[PDB]
Amino acid sequence: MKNIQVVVRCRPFNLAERKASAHSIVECDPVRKEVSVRTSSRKTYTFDMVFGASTKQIDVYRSVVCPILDEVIMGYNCTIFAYGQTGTGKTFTMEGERSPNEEYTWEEDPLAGIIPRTLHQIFEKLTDNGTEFSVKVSLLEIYNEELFDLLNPSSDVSERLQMFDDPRNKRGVIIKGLEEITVHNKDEVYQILEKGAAKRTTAATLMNAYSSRSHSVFSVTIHMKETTIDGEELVKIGKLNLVDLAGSENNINQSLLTLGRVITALVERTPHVPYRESKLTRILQDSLGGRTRTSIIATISPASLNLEETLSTLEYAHRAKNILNKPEVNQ
Ligand SMILES: COc1ccc(C(SC[C@H](N)C(=O)O)(c2ccccc2)c2ccccc2)cc1
Ligand SMILES: Nc1ncnc2c1ncn2[C@@H]1O[C@H](COP(=O)(O)OP(=O)(O)O)[C@@H](O)[C@H]1O
Ligand SMILES: [Mg+2]
Ligand code: NA
Numbered sequence: 001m002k003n004i005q006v007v008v009r010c011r012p013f014n015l016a017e018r019k020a021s022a023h024s025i026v027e028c029d030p031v032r033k034e035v036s037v038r039t040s041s042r043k044t045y046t047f048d049m050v051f052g053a054s055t056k057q058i059d060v061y062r063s064v065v066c067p068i069l070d071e072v073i074m075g076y077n078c079t080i081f082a083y084g085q086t087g088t089g090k091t092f093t094m095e096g097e098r099s100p101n102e103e104y105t106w107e108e109d110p111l112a113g114i115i116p117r118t119l120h121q122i123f124e125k126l127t128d129n130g131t132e133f134s135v136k137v138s139l140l141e142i143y144n145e146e147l148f149d150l151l152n153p154s155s156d157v158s159e160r161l162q163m164f165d166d167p168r169n170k171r172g173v174i175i176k177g178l179e180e181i182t183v184h185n186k187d188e189v190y191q192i193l194e195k196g197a198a199k200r201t202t203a204a205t206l207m208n209a210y211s212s213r214s215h216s217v218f219s220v221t222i223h224m225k226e227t228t229i230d231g232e233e234l235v236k237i238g239k240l241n242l243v244d245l246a247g248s249e250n251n252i253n254q255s256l257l258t259l260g261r262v263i264t265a266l267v268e269r270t271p272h273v274p275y276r277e278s279k280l281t282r283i284l285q286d287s288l289g290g291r292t293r294t295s296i297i298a299t300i301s302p303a304s305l306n307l308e309e310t311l312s313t314l315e316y317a318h319r320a321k322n323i324l325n326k327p328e329v330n331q
Contacts, residue, residue, distance in 0.1 A: 004323040005295040007049040007064060008035050008314070010302055011089040017303030026302040026310065028052030035300070037311060045318050048295075053302060057096055057110060061117045064295065068240070069121060071293050072222060073129075075236030075329040079243060079287035080114065083317060084299030085309040086212040086247030093297055094216070094244040106190045115218050115242055116193060122222065123186040132225045135183045139196045140175060142215040142279050143207055145251050150196040150203070152179040157202045163282060171275075171286040180221075215255055215280050216244040237330040241287065245280075248316065249309050255280035260316075262288055267322045291328045296320055 010028050013019055027036040028050050036044045051060060068078050082090035096113025098106070106112060107120055119137075126133045139150040140161075147161040166172040181192055204210040222238040246256045258278035265273040266289045275285040287294045298317035300310040 001324065001326045002293065004320055004325060005048045005293075006298060006317050006321045007051065007295065008045075008047050008298045008300060008317065009051040009055060009060065009089065009093060010035070010053050010300050011092070012053040013302055014087070017301065017305050019303065021304075024302060025304050025307065026300065030055075035314060037307070037314065039307070039311070043311070043314075045314050047298075047318070048321070057113055057117070060093060060297075061114060064297065065114055065118055066121075068293065068295065069118060069125070071327075072220075072238035072240045073125065073224070075224070075238050075331060076293050076327055077239040077241075077286065077291065077330065078293045078295075079241040079284065080295045080297060081241075081243035081245055081284075081287075082297045082299060083245050083248060084313050085249050085301065085306060087306070088299035088301050088310075088313075090244050090247075090297075090299050091211075091216075093299060094218075094242055106193075107186075116189070118240065118242070119183070119189045119193075119220065120186055122220070126222070126224070134223045136180045136221050137183055137192060138175075138178050138180050138217075138219045140178060140217045140219070140283075141200070141203065142217070142255055142283075143203075143210060143213055145254050145279050147175060147279065148203055148214075149175075149177070149179050150199040151181055151192065152177075153195065157199050158206060163279060169286070171290045173282050173285075175283075212247040213250055213252060215246050217283060218242045218244075235331055239330070241284070241292075243284065243287075248313055254278045259284075263316075263320055263323065267319050287325075289323055289325060291326055293327045294323075294325055 025038045030050050033050050034044055034046055035050055036042050071078050082094045084090055095115050097111040099109045099111050141148045162176045163173045166174050220240045224236045226234040228234050250256055255278040258281045262273055262281050275281045286292045296317055298313055300313050
C-alpha cells in the first residue's frame with residue numbers, strides 16, 4: 001500500500017577530507033533526484049529526494065518533514081530514521097546543533113534540525129487548527145542492547161529499562177518506566193531538549209564510543225479530539241518517531257546487524273523477519289513492513305576518504321525503497 005520513502009543528504013567537505021579533483025566524486029542532482037558517484041566510471045542511484053552539500057536545515061525540514069507532520073496530524077504513525085557513516089550528519093539532520101553566544105533563539109537557530117523545528121511547528125499548526133490536543137515526548141537510547149532514558153528527571157542515567165510486548169499492539173513494545181513528558185506549549189520545549197542533551201553527555205562518560213554506537217529514539221505522541229457531524233467524539237493519536245541510528249560502519253552491534261537482516265528479509269520477501277532478535281527492531285517492528293509511514297534519510301560524505309562507506313550507504317538505502325508498509329490511522 002505504501003513504499004518506504006528514501007532520501008539522501010550529502011554534507012559539505014569537512015576539515016579532514018582532501019578534494020584533489022576538479023569534478024566531484026559525488027554529484028547530487030535534486031531535480032532528477034539522482035546521486036552519482038565516481039568510483040571515469042560512475043554509479044547513479046535514483047531516490048525519492050536528493051539534497052546536496054549546500055542544502056540548509058530549513059530546506060530539509062520543509063521538503064521532508066512538513067508533509068510527514070501533516071500525516072501525523074491525520075493520526076498516522078510515522079518514522080523518520082537517519083542512516084549513514086559516523087561523521088556524515090545523522091545527528092546534525094535529526095537534532096541539529098545550538099549556535100553560540102545566544103546569537104539566536106532556539107526557534108530561529110539556523111543550525112537547529114528536525115526535532116526542534118517539528119516540536120515548534122506542532123504548536124503553531126494545532127493552535128490555529130482550533131483542535132483540542134496534548135503532546136508528550138520521550139527520548140530513549142539503545143547501546144549494547146540496553147535502554148537508557150534521557151528524560152527521566154530524577155534517576156542516574158545508568159539505571160537501564162526493560163521492554164515487553166504490548167498487549168494492545170501485535171507489532172509493538174512498551175518500555176517500562178520510560179519517562180513521557182507532556183509539553184504544554186512551545187516555551188516548555190527547549191528545557192526538555194536541554195535536559196536530554198545533558199544527560200546524554202553523562203552517558204557518554206560511562207560507555208565506549210557512545211555517540212557512534214548508540215541509536216537515539218525521540219518519540220512525539222499527539223492526542224487530538226474532534227467532534228463528528230453525527231455528534232460523536234473522535235480521538236486520534238498521531239505518533240512521530242525520529243530515529244538517529246548507530247553509525248553504519250560498525251551485542252555492541254546486535255541492533256544494527258539485525259536491522260540489516262530485517263531489511264534484507266523484507267525486500268527478498270523471505271518468510272521470517274527477525275524483528276525479535278534486537279531491541280531496535282522490536283521497537284521499530286511497525287516502521288519496517290507494518291502500519292507506519294516510514295522515511296529514511298541516508299547521509300553520505302562527498303570525499304574520496306569515505307567513498308567505500310558512502311557507496312555501502314547508498315546501496316543499503318536504495319534497496320530499502322522496496323519495503324512495502326500498510327499505513328493506518330489511529331481513529
Ligand atoms: C533530542 O533532541 C534534541 C536535543 C537537543 C537539541 C539542541 S542540539 C543537540 C545536539 N545535537 C547534541 O548532540 O547535544 C540543543 C542543544 C543544546 C541545548 C539544548 C538543545 C538544539 C535544540 C534546538 C535548537 C538547536 C539545537 C536538539 C534536539
Ligand atoms: N549538512 C551539513 N552542513 C554542515 N555541516 C555538517 C552537515 N552535516 C554534518 N555536519 C558537521 O559534520 C560533523 C559530523 O556531524 P554529526 O551530526 O555528528 O554526524 P553523525 O551523527 O552522523 O556522526 C559535525 O561537525 C557537523 O556539524
Ligand atoms: Mg550522531
Ligand atoms: Na547488563
